[PDB]
Design an enzyme around this catalytic site. Structure first.
Site, short mmCIF file in Angstrom:
data_model
loop_
_atom_site.label_atom_id
_atom_site.label_comp_id
_atom_site.label_asym_id
_atom_site.label_seq_id
_atom_site.Cartn_x
_atom_site.Cartn_y
_atom_site.Cartn_z
N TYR A 76 -6.48 -2.88 8.87
CA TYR A 76 -6.41 -2.20 7.58
C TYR A 76 -7.44 -1.08 7.52
O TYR A 76 -8.57 -1.22 7.99
CB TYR A 76 -6.63 -3.20 6.45
CG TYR A 76 -6.74 -2.55 5.09
CD1 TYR A 76 -5.63 -1.99 4.47
CD2 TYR A 76 -7.96 -2.48 4.44
CE1 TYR A 76 -5.74 -1.39 3.22
CE2 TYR A 76 -8.08 -1.89 3.21
CZ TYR A 76 -6.97 -1.34 2.60
OH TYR A 76 -7.11 -0.76 1.37
N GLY A 95 10.32 0.59 6.99
CA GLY A 95 10.06 -0.46 6.04
C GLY A 95 8.78 -0.16 5.30
O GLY A 95 8.04 0.75 5.64
N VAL A 138 4.95 -0.80 3.90
CA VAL A 138 3.68 -1.21 4.49
C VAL A 138 2.92 -2.01 3.44
O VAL A 138 2.80 -1.57 2.29
CB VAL A 138 2.87 0.00 4.97
CG1 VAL A 138 1.76 -0.45 5.92
CG2 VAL A 138 3.79 1.04 5.61
N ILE A 166 0.83 -1.20 0.00
CA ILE A 166 0.00 0.00 0.00
C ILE A 166 0.87 1.26 0.00
O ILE A 166 0.60 2.22 -0.73
CB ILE A 166 -0.97 0.02 1.20
CG1 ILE A 166 -0.28 -0.28 2.53
CG2 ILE A 166 -2.07 -1.02 0.98
CD1 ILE A 166 -1.23 -0.26 3.73
N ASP A 216 3.56 14.26 15.05
CA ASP A 216 3.60 14.23 13.59
C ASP A 216 2.19 14.03 13.02
O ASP A 216 1.87 13.02 12.39
CB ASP A 216 4.53 13.13 13.06
CG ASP A 216 4.76 13.25 11.56
OD1 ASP A 216 4.38 14.30 10.99
OD2 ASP A 216 5.30 12.30 10.96
C1 LIG Z 1 -0.14 0.18 8.94
C2 LIG Z 1 -1.48 0.82 8.79
C3 LIG Z 1 -1.80 1.57 10.14
C4 LIG Z 1 -1.43 1.87 7.67
N1 LIG Z 1 -0.50 2.70 7.44
N2 LIG Z 1 -0.77 3.42 6.48
C5 LIG Z 1 0.13 4.48 6.04
C6 LIG Z 1 0.34 5.61 6.91
CL1 LIG Z 1 -0.39 5.75 8.54
C7 LIG Z 1 1.19 6.63 6.50
C8 LIG Z 1 1.78 6.57 5.25
C9 LIG Z 1 1.53 5.50 4.42
C10 LIG Z 1 0.69 4.47 4.82
CL2 LIG Z 1 0.40 3.11 3.71
C11 LIG Z 1 -1.86 3.27 5.90
N3 LIG Z 1 -2.45 3.82 4.88
C12 LIG Z 1 -3.69 3.40 4.53
C13 LIG Z 1 -4.46 3.99 3.34
C14 LIG Z 1 -4.24 3.19 2.02
C15 LIG Z 1 -3.23 3.40 1.09
C16 LIG Z 1 -3.20 2.64 -0.08
C17 LIG Z 1 -4.18 1.69 -0.33
O1 LIG Z 1 -4.21 0.89 -1.49
C18 LIG Z 1 -3.07 0.82 -2.29
C19 LIG Z 1 -3.51 0.28 -3.65
O2 LIG Z 1 -2.39 -0.21 -4.34
C20 LIG Z 1 -5.19 1.50 0.59
C21 LIG Z 1 -5.23 2.26 1.74
N4 LIG Z 1 -4.29 2.34 5.22
C22 LIG Z 1 -3.67 1.76 6.25
O3 LIG Z 1 -4.19 0.87 6.84
C23 LIG Z 1 -2.46 2.20 6.62
#
Ligand SMILES: CC(C)c1nn(-c2c(Cl)cccc2Cl)c2nc(Cc3ccc(OCCO)cc3)[nH]c(=O)c12
EC number: 2.7.11.22
Lengths: 248, 329, 826
Positions: free
Chosen positions: B101, B25, B27, B19, B145
């Site tokens: 998620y 690392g 995610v 994602i 942050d």
């Molecule tokens: C580990 C968990 C708490 C998490 N982390 N994060 C995150 C953060 Cl908090 C900051 C920067 C980047 C990300 Cl991926 C998150 N984003 C998201 C939004 C998100 C981003 C991309 C998605 O599809 C990708 C399709 O190829 C779907 C949802 N959903 C999370 O659950 C999450």
């Protein structure tokens, strides 16, 4: 949800160390040495008291799951402090902990660190984290000693003598398995209880319930006096086993 | 038991994809093989071994296990790669932090910009955010942050704060020296731009204040590339820092250094006159210059704007999923 | 880093606005036509239009209005761009030398504001005292038209009514007065305010609020004989002036939404109205003179004149001639006659101005085996829908094939000497319970025909109620001959089934060439479709045979042939199907890490996925394992309108903000994280909405064509009819062309004094970045049009690099040669 970190005294007869042929006196000695190593190393580095204790609690917990014969204790001690520093936000570089450990350890003792001290310590971090089940948050008798003392009102000087005497008892209990038998809140009370007996103070008078002879019950519910006595006896046992005497 | 973290293998998750890129690392989105739940796995690599396990992750593990709230992201467990070896000291296998998620992130939803946010949508959004911040602040933790990307929203309208990588305990009695470069420039409070260490929890309020304004325009409020330009933009809106409104501004290291072009008057109510009255007053208190005069999270919940919001009536923002693809002729 | 070059092959054709006045001379009657970024100036004659001048601007033209302040001999022009660049312009002619003067200019963007739903509105006072701008909800911006305001400085007045629909300055008022329709929870209301330049605030307006129709759309300021305003809705037209109130609700206008208006008689006695179905009405103001000598408005009447192209703007010129400016179809000159013809119509078409309309899809095909290529577009909408055949021959030769229904996708099948085209037509719920089409069209005028009898969604337990008069889309697959463009066959899909994707290919070991269509079951209740089909058709012997159908749990937004296998995207899923020896589709592997897999492209075993909000992802098919692998994702969030693969490492995308970007593999093996990072190395504000990227070129290839510095060829179609071309450069060639741009930008004078660098900067409501990796070929190709003094000024101190000679000075004659070779790629 959260793991259980407390055993019965009777259970300590079955640590891995015991079952590999280590006798009780020797494991107790190893624990004291490892704890005091952590304490001395971190003190030289200028570390907060919470950070020293956290490292010691990790160390004590670790050797409920591993044997002193397979994991050299001073390496384990050093590793615990390293992580303890990152957990408690008083971080230190691994190279600096090694430097201090070498200053304080003789040549034989520093042999435990092998040919590459830094590597041996860094490698163990994985095992420690899995061993403590990533339960990094730890509470210590200190914060309760102060939270409860703040609620005592009376002679400023008698209460401060109680606090300092109990504080020293807390520092001494880190060398023991009490960290593994009783929650810190009980320890804080136990050390208050011990300092009170030694100073001929009747703490109840300083409480909001001056005719409540069991002064601690308003701080820690469900504590048998027997439990407190067992803790006190164990602290004084350590004092007698040495040459050192009660601080008074 | 459920508490024996660090042993279960990542084999138990079918990885769906990456994602996003994190700090320690990448995610990944994944599905639990046994239950079918969607989770987010944050990969923690200790292979670098410069300082071993990343502290950023240590904070997230230490704090998020203590913190349980509807508006805080629930860390479920920690899993590992196959040792692939019977002996330790040869293992470089990484650890993964399992999280609930979340369907979307606020910045992502905004960057498309066709998302429509009504007053009631903002009420429901902000109330959850402030309730979570209040939970965290009562427990004496500072996020340090807060940005749009860190706010996470699933389609039900549930808001959850995340990425507590920089979170640390705040002590009011003992003043503690802090890093002083923690919040992203766009969401950084004027106190930090002036190099104020020993900052108060009011830093998080300012960030949430910038978000409040952003939700009514769909554009961030203070967009700058350099610390001085940011102070200038804030000053054009909030007024220039001066002892008249910030008695302790003189103690801040860079006050004599970072002067804005003018000593601006505050225009926040004028440049935001299109905002509902109940909301605008919340913004003025949240975007107060002096952190000692800046409102608290609890005080935001006791505002005419958020006090009487009903948590049950989630009122989710309308998200386009059909007829968005082909623009209506 | 990556280096690319972007040129216009066909300029924007859709009419975005049109005004009349006295702009070139106080004597001539002018017609100013605005196409996206392009201004056309015409002079009205008795036969038609005489063109006089065309300029380009570094901005999308949002507002265009003519006004004449006291002291000016002739009308001045105000223009505001979509990036909020404002300017006042003057036409000046010195004999044969025609130039456009920038009299005042500036950028009126506010640091803080919410962009309004009904878009930028600009109006000017009848006494030309001020310019009114509605840029943000809750704010009204005033540019006072004083002689000294050469920078167009302006102030905001707080506006209580947040949701404004339309506004105009009213005629016949003691002070500058605005009339506006606004929306609050109680419905829509018409309200008035007075504008005070001295106090810089609103004062109480001349007449009180009246409640108006819920879908009140447009405001008309009526001239002084009557005064007041007219409010156009979906069902009713109303006139308001203080205590006077009229309302006519003729049933004829309810049938189609009215979208444009224009005044015919300066008295205000007559107005023109146009609606989405293309009808042209006459709105008549019936006067009654009182004994005071004063004339009051007696009644309103609406009379149908005929049919025109669906018009974005109307403007009456003179005599009986009207200019019809259309965005969806061809623009026109039409003559209005006093007497109807034998069919009852008062409208007779004079001239037809080509508009490629919205280009929904397109393909390049060599119809005549010429090595050239002809471009076949899906152009227009509704009754204006059409195919266009486009070839180079110096102008473009364009054949038009009317369809009278909306074309959606096109793909060429050579084996059958025909095209497949997806289309949708509008029918209306009628008293039979079924539906009736408003007009015949391609899917009804096919030679042979068929209707899907699929039983897949036959249970339909969930009810969908119909109300008489509601519109529905009916989707078809058209088989169209490549020489005659006769509709040979029309296949109608299921009720409520939308055709979204179309391919022509062979699969597996099957020698037959099929048409394959991906569909979605669309119900008004569903946020996102949850049912869909992949249908395999064979066109054989004048008939379309249904070969196989595969049910899917979503919308088949995109499909593409993939090494004899069928690659389709269903909602979030990206799926690979195999074609068995039993002529059925069989799933091999799936990829699910998407929000909505809207766009697919392939090259070798690589797949480029375009997502609704997650930009682009590079997939790879791994044959050793039989599944997909994620290669790299562009983490910056962009809403995609179309994607394309440039080469094995560079990927091209188009944003809904009218931006183009290029992503590349980081090609750094230090960390697996870097490899998985697609780095946006190209950023460019196109100014057009790109619907389709398509590999190919229209240039004749006799094989004798000098190898141009540019390598590769991607064409793209846009909503405004603009067709463009993207191509790659060597690092050496980019630097030269880029260094030359910076020199040209200092030399060339921009209309409105708009910085070129500003115009091409990447731009969303949330971001503005300087352009990178892109050469504005339209700027480069303007070097050939600048006067000799300016050419030599440009080449001063210009050096070449990484060439036969490492440093080599450029001359004016040297660059004329290079640019002329660059003009030969289109
Ligand atoms: C580990 C968990 C708490 C998490 N982390 N994060 C995150 C953060 Cl908090 C900051 C920067 C980047 C990300 Cl991926 C998150 N984003 C998201 C939004 C998100 C981003 C991309 C998605 O599809 C990708 C399709 O190829 C779907 C949802 N959903 C999370 O659950 C999450």
């Amino acid at each position: 949800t959260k793991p259980c970190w407390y055993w019965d005294k009777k259970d300590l007869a079955h640590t891995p160390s015991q079952l590999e042929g280590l006798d009780p006196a020797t494991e107790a000695r190893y624990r004291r040495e490892g704890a005091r190593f952590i304490f001395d190393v971190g003190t030289r580095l200028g570390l907060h008291y919470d950070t020293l204790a956290t490292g010691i609690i990790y160390f004590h917990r670790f050797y409920m799951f591993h044997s002193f014969k397979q994991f050299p204790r001073y390496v384990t001690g050093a590793c615990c402090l390293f992580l303890a520093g990152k957990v408690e936000e008083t971080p230190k570089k691994c190279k600096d902990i090694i430097k201090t450990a070498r200053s304080l350890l003789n040549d034989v003792q520093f042999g435990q660190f092998g040919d590459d001290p830094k590597e041996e310590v860094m490698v163990l971090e994985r095992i420690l984290l899995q061993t403590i089940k990533f339960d990094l948050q730890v509470e210590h008798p200190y914060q309760f000693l102060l939270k409860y003392a703040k609620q005592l009102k009376g002679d400023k000087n008698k209460i401060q003598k109680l606090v300092q005497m109990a504080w020293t008892f807390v520092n001494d209990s880190l060398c023991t398995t009490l960290s593994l038998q009783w929650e810190p809140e009980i320890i804080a009370v136990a050390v208050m209880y011990l300092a009170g007996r030694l100073c001929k103070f009747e703490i109840q008078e300083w409480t909001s319930k001056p005719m409540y002879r069991r002064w601690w019950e308003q701080f820690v519910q469900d504590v048998p006096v027997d439990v407190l006595e067992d803790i006190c006896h164990q602290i004084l046992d350590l004092y007698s086993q040495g040459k050192q005497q009660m601080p008074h | 038991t459920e508490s024996d973290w660090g042993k279960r293998c990542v084999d138990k998750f079918d990885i769906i994809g990456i994602i996003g890129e994190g700090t320690y690392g990448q995610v990944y989105k994944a599905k639990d093989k046994d239950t079918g739940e969607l989770v987010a796995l944050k990969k923690v690599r200790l292979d670098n071994e410069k300082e071993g396990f990343p502290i950023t992750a240590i904070r997230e593990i230490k704090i998020l296990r203590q913190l349980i709230h509807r508006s805080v992201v629930n860390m479920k467990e920690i899993v590992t790669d196959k040792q692939d070896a019977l002996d330790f000291k040869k293992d470089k296998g990484a650890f993964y932090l399992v999280f609930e998620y979340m369907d979307h992130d606020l910045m992502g939803l905004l960057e498309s910009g066709l998302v429509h946010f009504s007053e009631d949508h903002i009420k429901s959004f902000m109330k959850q955010l402030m309730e979570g911040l209040e939970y965290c602040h009562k427990k004496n933790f500072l996020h340090r942050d807060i940005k749009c990307s860190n706010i996470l929203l699933n389609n039900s309208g549930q808001i959850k704060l995340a990425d507590f990588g920089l979170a640390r305990l705040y002590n009011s009695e003992e003043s503690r020296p802090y890093t002083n470069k923690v919040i992203t420039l766009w969401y950084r409070p004027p106190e930090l731009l002036l190099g104020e260490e020993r900052y108060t929890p009011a830093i998080d309020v300012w960030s949430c204040g910038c978000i409040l304004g952003e939700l009514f325009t769909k554009k961030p409020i203070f967009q700058a590339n350099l610390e001085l330009a940011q102070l200038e933009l804030i000053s054009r809106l909030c007024g220039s820092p001066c002892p008249a409104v910030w008695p302790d501004v003189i103690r801040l290291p860079y006050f004599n250094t970072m002067k804005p072009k003018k000593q601006y008057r505050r225009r926040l109510r004028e440049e935001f006159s299109f905002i509902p009255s109940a909301a605008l007053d919340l913004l003025d208190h949240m975007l107060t210059l002096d952190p000692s005069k800046r409102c608290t999270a609890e005080q935001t919940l006791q505002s005419d704007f958020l006090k009487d919001v009903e948590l049950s009536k989630m009122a989710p923002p309308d998200l386009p999923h059909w007829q968005d693809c082909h623009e209506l002729w | 880093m990556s280096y690319n070059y972007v040129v216009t092959a066909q300029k924007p054709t859709a009419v975005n606005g049109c005004v009349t006045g006295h702009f070139t001379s106080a004597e001539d009657l002018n017609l100013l036509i605005a196409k996206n970024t392009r201004l056309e100036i015409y002079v009205v004659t008795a036969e038609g239009l005489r063109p006089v001048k065309e300029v380009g601007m570094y901005g999308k033209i949002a507002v265009m209005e003519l006004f004449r302040p006291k002291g000016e001999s002739k009308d001045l022009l105000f223009i505001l761009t979509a990036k909020y660049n404002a300017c006042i312009l003057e036409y000046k002619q010195s004999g044969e030398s025609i130039d456009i003067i920038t009299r005042a200019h500036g950028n009126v963007q506010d640091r803080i504001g919410r962009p309004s739903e009904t878009g930028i509105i600009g109006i000017i006072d009848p006494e030309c005292r001020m310019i009114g701008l509605r840029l943000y909800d809750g704010l009204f911006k005033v540019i006072p038209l004083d002689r000294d305001n050469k920078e167009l400085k302006a102030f905001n007045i707080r506006l209580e009514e947040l949701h404004v629909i339309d506004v105009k300055f009213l005629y016949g008022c003691q002070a500058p007065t605005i009339c506006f329709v606004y929306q609050d929870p109680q419905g829509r209301h018409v309200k008035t305010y007075e504008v005070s330049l001295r106090e810089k605030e609103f004062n109480k307006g001349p007449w009180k609020q009246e409640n108006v129709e819920a879908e009140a759309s447009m405001v008309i300021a009526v001239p002084e004989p009557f005064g007041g305003a007219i409010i156009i809705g979906q069902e009713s037209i109303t006139y308001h002036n203080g205590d006077k109130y009229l309302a006519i609700a003729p049933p004829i206008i309810k049938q189609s939404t009215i979208v444009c208006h224009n005044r015919v008689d300066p008295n205000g006695s007559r107005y023109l109205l146009g609606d989405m179905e293309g009808r042209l009405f006459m709105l008549l103001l019936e006067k009654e003179e009182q004994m005071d000598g004063t004339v009051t408005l007696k009644d309103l009447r609406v009379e149908l004149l005929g049919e025109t192209s669906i018009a974005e703007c109307l403007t009456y010129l003179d005599n009986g001639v009207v200019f019809v400016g259309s965005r969806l179809g061809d623009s026109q000159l039409v003559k209005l006659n006093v007497d109807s013809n034998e069919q009852g119509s008062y409208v007779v078409a004079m001239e037809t101005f080509t508009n490629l309309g919205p280009i929904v899809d397109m393909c390049v095909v060599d119809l005549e085996r010429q090595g050239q290529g002809q471009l076949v577009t899906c152009s227009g909408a509704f009754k204006e829908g059409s195919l266009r055949i486009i070839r180079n021959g110096q102008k473009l030769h364009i054949r038009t094939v009317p369809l009278y229904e909306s074309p959606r996708k096109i793909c060429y099948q050579e084996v059958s000497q025909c095209f497949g085209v997806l289309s949708s037509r509008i029918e209306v719920q009628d008293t039979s319970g079924g539906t009736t089409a408003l007009r015949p069209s391609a899917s009804t005028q096919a030679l042979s025909s068929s209707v899907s009898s699929s039983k897949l969604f036959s249970s339909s337990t969930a009810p969908h109620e119909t109300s008489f008069g509601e519109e529905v889309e009916v989707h078809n697959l058209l088989i169209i001959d490549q020489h005659t463009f006769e509709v040979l066959h029309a296949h109608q899909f299921l009720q409520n089934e939308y055709a979204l994707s179309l391919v022509s290919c062979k699969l597996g070991k099957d020698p037959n060439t099929y048409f394959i269509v991906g569909t979605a079951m669309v119900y008004p209740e569903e946020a996102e479709p949850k049912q869909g089909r992949i249908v395999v058709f064979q066109y054989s012997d004048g008939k379309l045979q249904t070969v196989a159908e595969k049910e899917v749990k979503g919308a088949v937004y995109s499909m593409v042939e993939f090494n004899g296998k069928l690659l389709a995207s269903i909602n979030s899923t990206v799926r690979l199907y195999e074609w068995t020896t039993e002529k059925e589709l069989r799933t091999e592997c799936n990829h699910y890490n998407n929000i909505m897999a809207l766009y697919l492209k392939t090259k070798g075993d690589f797949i480029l996925v375009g997502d609704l909000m997650r930009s682009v992802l590079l997939l790879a098919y791994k044959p050793m394992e039989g599944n997909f692998e994620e290669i790299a994702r562009d983490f910056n969030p962009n809403w995609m309108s179309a994607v394309e693969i440039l080469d094995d490492d560079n990927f091209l995308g188009a944003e809904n903000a009218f931006n183009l970007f290029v992503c590349q593999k980081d090609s750094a093996a230090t960390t697996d994280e870097e490899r998985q990072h697609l780095q946006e190395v190209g950023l460019f504000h196109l100014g057009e909405f790109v619907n389709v990227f398509c590999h190919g070129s229209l240039v004749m290839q006799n094989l004798g064509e000098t190898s141009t510095p540019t390598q590769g060829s991607v064409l793209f179609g846009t909503v405004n009819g603009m067709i463009g071309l993207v191509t790659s450069l060597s690092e050496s060639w980019y630097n030269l062309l880029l260094d030359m741009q910076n020199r040209l930008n200092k030399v060339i004078k921009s209309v409105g004094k708009i910085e070129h660098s500003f115009w091409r900067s990447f731009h969303t409501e949330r971001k503005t970045e300087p352009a990178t990796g892109f050469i504005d070929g339209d700027l480069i190709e303007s070097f050939l049009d600048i006067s000799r003094p300016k050419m030599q000024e440009v080449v001063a101190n210009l050096q070449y690099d990484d060439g036969s000679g490492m440093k080599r000075e450029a001359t004016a004659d040297d660059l004329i040669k290079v640019v002329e070779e660059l003009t030969r790629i289109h």
